[PDB]
RNA sequence: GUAAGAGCCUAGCAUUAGUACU
């Protein structure tokens, strides 16, 4: 279901939420945007050429809650393949362990196809993602200038 | 040009490094020569390092920031120049001329959104009347009179002055709005309130309502002035009232 | 250690010994005048006339020593007063050193061979 | 020292908000150029 | 606190006795006094010591001992070539090098996709034979009395005579490093599949193809580099014909796929058909 | 004087906007670009000519522009 | 900050006890829970307080090899130490004196356990494949 | 007879 | 025109003036203006006392 | 660009094909929006902007770098502004004597660390001696494969300090460098320039000195 | 907020000046043969030491002003003096690059702190550690072990002479002001500035701590600023400008701030409101130049009731409160709140 | 996120017999115990 | 006449790493 919005301290960009190939994950992102969950919520893990992880409210990166109360299962397909930048996928700690944490990809990451459930792509504001991947990060890939998600909500 | 060049360059660079380890820190002048020479050699990695070593000695010299950013501008290194400007304007936010030349570089590239963002940062450091006036003239230059009006709002709040208000009202009477110029004089006396009692404020009220052909308004203005103004201040206002009559 | 590490000839502090006493005085004196100069100048005055103020201080010291009254026609009174106060500082120092070395010369206390000439 | 293999005591410009990859490429191209220049033209 | 070492230069033993000589040497690059580590990788080994500073080690992701890269174990050239990165800017001078160091004190190799080139040109099992005694210089001259007892290899030096003069600074920086030169000339030949004197032969032979690779799978392989004229299977030979319409496309297909690419796992060879 | 060279900086500002750019130039650059924010840092879409304009502009400025004892006195007759 | 429900009276929720000079092979809490008996490889027994300083107020020595296992006696004032020097030893805790040293085993006295209800009796099993029961008096 | 013991507050180190 | 700025194995050259000496500090005891002793008193009483004593017993008159 | 589940057979080739970027997981060719993902990403990542709830951008990252990351750097105008909130005796209140005692103790400990380093390390009559005992470490490599350490995972390293000869003279000669640039500069948070009259330009004209 | 907004807040809420009795100068002491440059009061409050350009340190009776003792050991001017509160020690620095520990039970120099490359300008004793801090023309604060004479630390970063120094037990344990116009607040454990304060336009020749508040004052030729600690938050400028280079600043427990000008002015300000209740000019002793009139040091005695000033006419001058004054007979210079709207 | 540079260096404490015994079961014999506690190493 | 240095030829101090093929 279409057009969730992230507006961050670096900018604002908007992602569609894929309905068919992954309904559980998309409903999760929809509703969590709706409830005010992805507010504050700094992009904690930014790796150039790789991804922009976000979604953990605690800022630790260790766990972000879901609408089902905990983990849920992937929706990997032979259809949904991490092929370029801007692909929005969920971050899991292995098979069938998704939380809330997501990552926008900045590059083609084949080596995640089969492990990380895609559910969308950045429809508007790829400039923000390009600028956001090149931000200064520390030895832990943590942005040295906090990149807050000042507000996330569907549109 | 080949390998005879390169060794003349070795010789002159060793000359520069010798002069610079001797005289570099204690008396300026030298890094400008070193950096302009390396710019002549079209070596900009080397010249940027020379400018960075100047600024590592003394960053509070506006002349050096200017020469650095101009080297970078005149060779179309425009993001490099922006970065030099960002640093110069971050570190010496009270040199107006840094801000001017950053704004000018941005509008020469037809980047008026970037020029305007530099104007916003500058207004945050609260410049003089000339800074706010340059911002207003900037927004006029691109025929953006709603933006220039919002800057005038902010301007007369930040520096609450008769100069701010009479300049606001002159802007309006140029702009096409005469009930708004009247509005801005009225608002100057209410908001400014006290300390709007002064000569040139009432002289300007008189001249406005005069070129508005509301001469009864203007008579009320001249009187209410002489009433409120200390008649020590009255000679000029009163001779100008004679000039009205 | 000097053989195997090399001489540490690098920014270790030199004492102010009898042979450096007068030259270090003038170092310190000029540095002091330079302090004052930089603080006395108004905010937008080109801070490079300090070298000519230091030359005026050298001149005023030679004029003190020779008993010559000086009056530079266009010297700011602040700069001139600074020069007079530091020439008087040097004059006090030099006269007190002369008093001291005269008492040593009179006693017979050990003085250098040049101290006798300098004191005369 | 060799002041044409290396940049003497190189102080690289510090990173800013603007990406200077392209500027660096242009500088290298300029360095690559070898137009004839007299000593007077190079010293000014 | 621990050397930064190639895990070949620690030998087979999971247990390492290593001597820690703090201030035991000068870095062979930064000329800096540093903490040396010395150890015997294994029982057939000699005692190897670290050759460079710990920092100067972890700058270029190289072992403190062999000065080879840490991920792939190939000289700093071969890795810099496949990394495509600029020549070393780092100052060769030691006044310059120490100034760069004292700067970087007071205030790119881990985030790359594994380069197939380096992976293709690396050793599968560890070169433990690099951790072994030098050659007995008295056995060379025929004058070794130590017999089989010699702790030094009782063989003769069998080495390229332009090699055996390698420079530390050059193997660390990447300039005229004869070993990586030999290696890149090797890959230059292997990247040199002979385009024959016949200009019009527009077909490439694909041999050694295991049977689970189908003709449209090899078509998916070769369509990228140009138009195919016809692809022809024959699993009897486990081989294939592929003709294109333009020579330069078959040239592309030789040049990219000459250094033994693997289609869906099968180690397959290419030839000019 | 900073006021003198300030009206000369405004000389240069209005002159160069009259010399290098036009109103439909500006407004169609904008019409391509909705954000005229939070986009700071990312270089904006503008014609590659603009750059040399600045350069040429400033370069324009450029073409507008004993021994030591002689200078000394030449300061004093100047003053005295 | 972080205010997570302090359970005990200890100054901090994680306290490291240092002062030993060898492996620490066995430890024991006093029955009244305000003492620590730590037996190290250094053939020595540290006595720590569980609260308010964690002060090792006594180091009892007297074994010639690693004190492998320590329990307290049911009242907490007498200690049973078992070692590798073939000698199990009863000590008085408050005092710093050894009470009764029995060394009947032929090899390292690995394990011991004193009886918790009844008399002052403890079992000790050592390397000789013999498990011996030991009454105090 | 205080012995050569100290107790100091320290976090527990973690390998990751 | 500009002084040298003085920013900061170790060298094993040992100066003669750097050999151990005066290796313990004197502290102010009870009786030498120690800090705990001086909170106890009113220093203004003693100052005005001493100043009055000086200023009268130099004037020589009651 | 065709919407969700409307893209079968429609493949992008150029930047302009993405609209405002993003890439398509349904498609199975590598896409490159905005030319992101072209080899290496460049050099020297840029500083980030920080924007408020309300949209006020922060450009401090220019000035808050290197050693300035750590310290108090006054960057804005509100640092220049008189603070009335803060002038009461109760607002300017020294820390708790307990915290000050902890600071005094920590500082004494660090300063005695340094002073004893300067005393001992630099003293050469300290007689050199025996071998710094073995310390074990467990070292887990970056690259562990069943061929490295012969199929073992980690390594225990016996780190044995070798004893230095007492007769070994100072081993390394000392090197000379110019001092580096220093910590990064800090904004000069001055009040507006006060205008030099031409008068006060002339009452600081210093005549040349004629000796 | 703004300069306008804050100016209106300031017109409404500025702390009013606390009435302070005027001070009068009651004693000149002649006898130094050069500019008196430093003062230091002994913690017992019964003698003070003054160092001079005549290279001596004189010990004076605080109640009679009597020369108790002259100490010669510096080769050049004595520029800084610090009497220890915890040790029977006096510390002097001088233009001779030398820092000396005087044993006041011997009246002799027992330790020397070697290492300044130029003349030393400032000195400070850590109040709780046995550590001293000196700054000089080499732009560096050298942190010394009092006992071992070892240079424990060098605080680097200033660019010109470190002219003023503060030492406290809380962090920042050293505050320096320099001729490079900045104030550095130092982290003494790390050897690093914890803050650099660039609000001054001229060189910071005087620092002073508030005796009781976590706040210090810095003084330039252009402003006296007041700063909150630990972080060096600018509190405000004094509500007037002594139009002088301020060489010395002392703060009282009543909050009398005394600032002493290079022109021999002495202004007394209300700490806490920033308002100067007194303005004096020095009289120079007979023979002096009126150019030779600066006020190089000032300290309050330990009670706060005496101010001892070290002057360039080579006198020590002593000031006491005219404390038989009442807010009616003696209000001094009267206060108008900062009613203006200005730019900051 | 790692400790050393090329891996994780962690302190260890054993009794000295164990380092030497394992170091020489592998060292001399070729085959010894993995120090991780996972089986044995080598041939 | 100092005595300084530049260079030329020939000119005995430090080092232990690195050497492959489907
Ligand atoms: Zn290795
Ligand atoms: Zn042999």
Author numbering:
A (entry chain S): 3 to 157
B (entry chain J): 51 to 295
C (entry chain A): 721 to 840
D (entry chain L): 207 to 250
E (entry chain O): 18 to 124, 138 to 303
F (entry chain M): 441 to 476, 482 to 510, 529 to 543
G (entry chain E): 45 to 181
H (entry chain b): 100 to 115
Direct quotes from the study:
The C complex is remodeled into the step II catalytically activated spliceosome (C* complex), representing a functional state poised and awaiting the exon ligation reaction. In the C* complex, the 3′-end of 5′-exon attacks the 5′-end of 3′-exon, generating a ligated exon and an intron lariat.
The U6/5′SS duplex extends to 16 nucleotides in Chlamydomonas C* compared to the eight nucleotides in S. cerevisiae. In addition, two catalytic and four structural metal ions are identified at the active site, which is attributed to the internal-stem-loop (ISL) of the U6 snRNA. Notably, a γ-monomethyl phosphate cap is structurally ascertained at the 5′-end of the U6 snRNA. The key nucleotide U67, of the U6 snRNA, is base-paired with the nucleotide G20 of the U2 snRNA, and two catalytic metal ions are coordinated by the phosphate group of U67, with M1 sharing a distance of 3.2 Å to the 3′-OH of the last nucleotide G-1 of the 5′-exon. The splicing factor Prp17 comprises four fragments (fragments I–IV) and a WD40 domain. Fragment III (residues: 165–203) of Prp17 contacts the 5′-SL of the U6 snRNA and stabilizes its conformation. Fragment IV (residues: 211–230) represents an α-helix and covers the U6/5′SS duplex, which is likely to assist in stabilizing the extended duplex.
